[PDB]
Amino acid sequence: NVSLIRFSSWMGGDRDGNPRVTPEVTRDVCLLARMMAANLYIDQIEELMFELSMWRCNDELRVRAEELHIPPNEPYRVILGHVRDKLYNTRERARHLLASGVSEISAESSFTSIEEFLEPLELCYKSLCDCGDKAIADGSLLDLLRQVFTFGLSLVKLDIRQESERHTDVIDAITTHLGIGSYREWSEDKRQEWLLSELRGKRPLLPPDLPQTEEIADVIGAFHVLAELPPDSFGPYIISMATAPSDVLAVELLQRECGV
Amino acid sequence: KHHSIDAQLRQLVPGKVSEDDKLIEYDALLVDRFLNILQDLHGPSLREFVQECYEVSADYEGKGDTTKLGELGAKLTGLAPADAILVASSILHMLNLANLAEEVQIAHRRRNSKLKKGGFADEGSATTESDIEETLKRLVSEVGKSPEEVFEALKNQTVDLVFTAHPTQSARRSLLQKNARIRNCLTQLNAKDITDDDKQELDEALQREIQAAFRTDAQPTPQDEMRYGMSYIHETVWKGVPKFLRRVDTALKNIGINERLPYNVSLIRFSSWMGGDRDGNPRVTPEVTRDVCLLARMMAANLYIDQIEELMFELSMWRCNDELRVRAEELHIPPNEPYRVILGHVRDKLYNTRERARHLLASGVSEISAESSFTSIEEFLEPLELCYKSLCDCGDKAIADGSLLDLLRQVFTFGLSLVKLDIRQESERHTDVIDAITTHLGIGSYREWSEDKRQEWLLSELRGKRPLLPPDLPQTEEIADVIGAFHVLAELPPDSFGPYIISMATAPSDVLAVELLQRECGVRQPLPVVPLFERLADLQSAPASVERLFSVDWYMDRIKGKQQVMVGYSDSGKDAGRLSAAWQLYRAQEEMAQVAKRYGVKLTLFHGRGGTVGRGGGPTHLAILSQPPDTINGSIRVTVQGEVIEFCFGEEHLCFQTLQRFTAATLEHGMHPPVSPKPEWRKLMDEMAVVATEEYRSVVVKEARFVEYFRSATPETEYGRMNIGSRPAKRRPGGGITTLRAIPWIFSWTQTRFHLPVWLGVGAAFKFAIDKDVRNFQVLKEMYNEWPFFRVTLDLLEMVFAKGDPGIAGLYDELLVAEELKPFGKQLRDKYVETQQLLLQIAGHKDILEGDPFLKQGLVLRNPYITTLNVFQAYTLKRIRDPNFKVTPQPPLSEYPPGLEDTLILTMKGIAAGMQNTG
């Protein structure tokens, strides 16, 4: 479970001075990553099923293998077969969400978290150890657990990046529309004072009928995509040309006001 | 827990057989790690027990003294049931590991031409045999054929290898892959300049794979047994045949031919008996045959889908000719990669081909149209050959001659069904059907008719235009099985099948009976009918039977100048002994070829189990070269016995060498036959055959107490009651031993390390020949060194004697046979000893297998595990058979009575695994 190495991507997340890389581009590369991961895991699991022909298992695994009922004297294959089924569903759900935007394939029939993916694999590992077969567990199955803890369900986590003046543009559109004045004209100290009174307050800010330029709509739309996608799809939100604390605090306010 | 097992191995074989001999090192590496795993899992005491068993049995080979075996048997019988299975299976797993090391050593042994002495004897071992290009060079320069003659001989060659089920072991695909990982870890560990850390990790992997094989284990369906028979095709042969055909290209270049073997040349084909052989096997129903045919087509479709998808990845080119560009436009991912668009369509149709078969298999019906799938080999190849031509037309022939040429050679080798299914049934079952027809129609009893009357009636029906089989016909279960089988053949595509083989064929009416049944059951593309001549008399009259068939206008019209005949070694050897069977088989072959030549018929021989051809490794090379002149001519079928299939095809390089062996030997024989026997040799073989048959029958047929001895000295009865052959052991519930079938006959006698069916008769014949004329002894050894037939025959006996041990046989005797018959057993063992030493003096060897130290070493290193299972078996039988034999139940060490059946199965499996092919 030690994540000694992890992998991230900017491709579809970095939009600094790149007007293609829309909100939907970001939604797309996220679902594409999850399909690729499901494919890689399905192959690893199938090779592992071939290998794990054993019949001796602990009680916990024997019980769950019975509940999943090809041959029942091959318990590790029964469990991993179920894992493969849920991985197939995870992939197809992602493919449907990518094409139509919608999937009749339930999230229950698929893997939504790394924790529920890990549960049957660690069950296999502990069962093999409990039967004195830790040496077998420390082969291919240990490789697979290390892949899960390295790559997750999306291979890479996506970094988002956007220039600081684009966030200032959005907030100046908000403050002028509300009649509070021009956030752009304010000094850095005044900006921090206002941002902190908003983040400390409990009343929302972003009006749904805010008049939006193409650029402003792209910033707000991007945040809206972040709110709709699973948190483990993302890493950090990077602010290009950051100059001052208000740059960081402004993104924290937009992120909240757009529902992340 | 401490010492290594290699000290005991060095006592067996002092000295290396080659410089790169590391077989004992490998055996120690695997077994030492296994024993450490054993101890980690089950404690030290049983590990030391198991190793002591191995040490006792290893000592025995060096000092043939039975009492130490009895010591061991006392210890073994006292083990609690759980410990008995554990020790037996442990010894089995160690034998497996030793066989894997033997495989690694063969595969990676450097060829050393200094071992060659010239002449045909070089072809009897892989250490000295000629590869395909050495054979090509010899044919050009020594024999004097032109490169173009050799090139066209190859273009017309076809070697057909026939898979048959393994009597005792399954060969799951997942186990073949554990084997490979153990072999790979072994070779990689012993690589040149390997890192400390690489070696550490490879060691851990090896220990891991050995444990995984140790921790994994009702008879199988005939469907399942077929799925397991196809494992070797998935693991080596599929990729192997393109690799070998590419070597044939390289060889042709190196004798001056500047073109590859055309990809439509079926140089090697593969057939199967699994699901088609129903001779005395009622579980092989019509439905089983329909199933294995559809199963094969699914396996082929998925292998092709994989090849095609790999090929799509590679063929990203955009340059194509006009025919391909127009077709790619018509199929309308990116359109600027036309080869991917064609192959994507081919993959689509292959997916439908697979799903259609799956539906027919489950429901019996498919709404997937045959139009949307591939129905013939021809429509599969049309788009592939279009891709090949297009690449060539654009100057990319070099690319075409890569993966795409591999695929085309796979299509022409494997077709849409991987293997062609042979059908086999006993002749009397066809007679039963025809008698049912003739009596129901009221024209008499076909069974009561003489052979000449049968032929007269059959021919009038075959020549007439009126149907014969009424759908009303009253049917037994067996008659309904025969008719139902023909009805399945009529319903399936003709390319699913090869021949229809008639077991126990004796006369032309047997062949023409099947021709009539085929037609009257509606088989519109009839199968070639192949008689299997089993008994000595049937072999003697086979040239007459084949001449009568060839003299019938209707039959010549049917066969179109092609006839296949099957010959059986274990079958004929059971009738009259191996020596007499060997010689009649030679004569029958040369006279049948003479008949065929006169009538313009191309005669192909199919070599059944137990033969010299079909031995593992080099011996098959010489065996094929030794067959009578002008009996092959580029066409031969050979069964791949289950006992040797692992050594022949389990490993990449072994697969390659096997394909090369059959291809080279078959090619050379057609242009370079062995010497014709000189009259002195023929007369001597004639006289020795009389004596050998007489003494074989003296023990087998005419001695009243033989069957009683056989049922006690062997585990036959248990082998039958446990259905280890997945087949009835006998045809009638009584009869002599003449009713017993060959597989049980050979199996039971090799379990006891005695091997009577292989050698009995030879001793009497050798001594008779030497004693009746002083000159005969020198002419016998002259035969051994100048007559390949005699050499090959005798080398088979030598190999079997290396696998035999009279002490072990006598151990079965002393505990299992009644006092009254023990002198009979020692009489037989006296015949054994006299045959062996007479065998050694001819050939001029002081020791067994002195001419092949490599084979001697490989065989000897198996016996510690085998002999251990031998004593475990003998004592297990005595417990199974005698309630009064008392055992001291020893405390634990972490059907029939408890555990005894499992133990006995394990000994049977292990002894068979160690003994592989005998007779």
Place this chain on the structure above:
Amino acid sequence: NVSLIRFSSWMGGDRDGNPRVTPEVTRDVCLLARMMAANLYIDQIEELMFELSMWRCNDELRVRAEELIPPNEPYRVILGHVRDKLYNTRERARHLLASGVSEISAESSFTSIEEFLEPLELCYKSLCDCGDKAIADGSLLDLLRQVFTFGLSLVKLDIRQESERHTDVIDAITTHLGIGSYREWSEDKRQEWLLSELRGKRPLLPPDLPQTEEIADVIGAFHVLAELPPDSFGPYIISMATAPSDVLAVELLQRECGV
């Protein structure tokens, strides 16, 4: 169960001097009739389901309804299963009509009149056992009378062909077999030969028989009759029948073509 009135059809079966009526046309109208019957039955059953909301049933029906939408409405449970099997029966016919083959199993559908009747007669008995025979004698009785009147194909198909077309087929057989010309034989000789074949136990029709377009149509029609359910058909009518051999010839051809 009294079939006081039955209905037959000549359409797609009569081919007397009518080459448009091919074996395929006969196979088609037989499956079309089965689709029409399934549709009419599905509507009747659904109307019946609406009416039979009772909860009182006998034990045979209660058990069958617990096996196999609300369980308090057992007659609707049974009739809902019938409708499922009727829809399968129709789809199977539609597939055979278009493709010639159907992966819809005959088990999941109704293959005989009696297996269609079994659940309906169970409902009728159950209603009677609960003193509801009056309700049984309404719509459920009408449906049962429809089943015994129309079957699973609405109508039974008559086949008709002219006797000389059958003579043509038999003369082709006797000449090809080299036993003479059935056409030139007198009536008495035809009867003598036909009877020896009908009484004999050896088949007659060679699969290699050279066939004209007309002879192939006759043999092909018989092959269609052999492949379809027996309850799709009524009689085989011989136009221009003049003598017993006309009838006996069709009996021979029916058998040798596998009916």
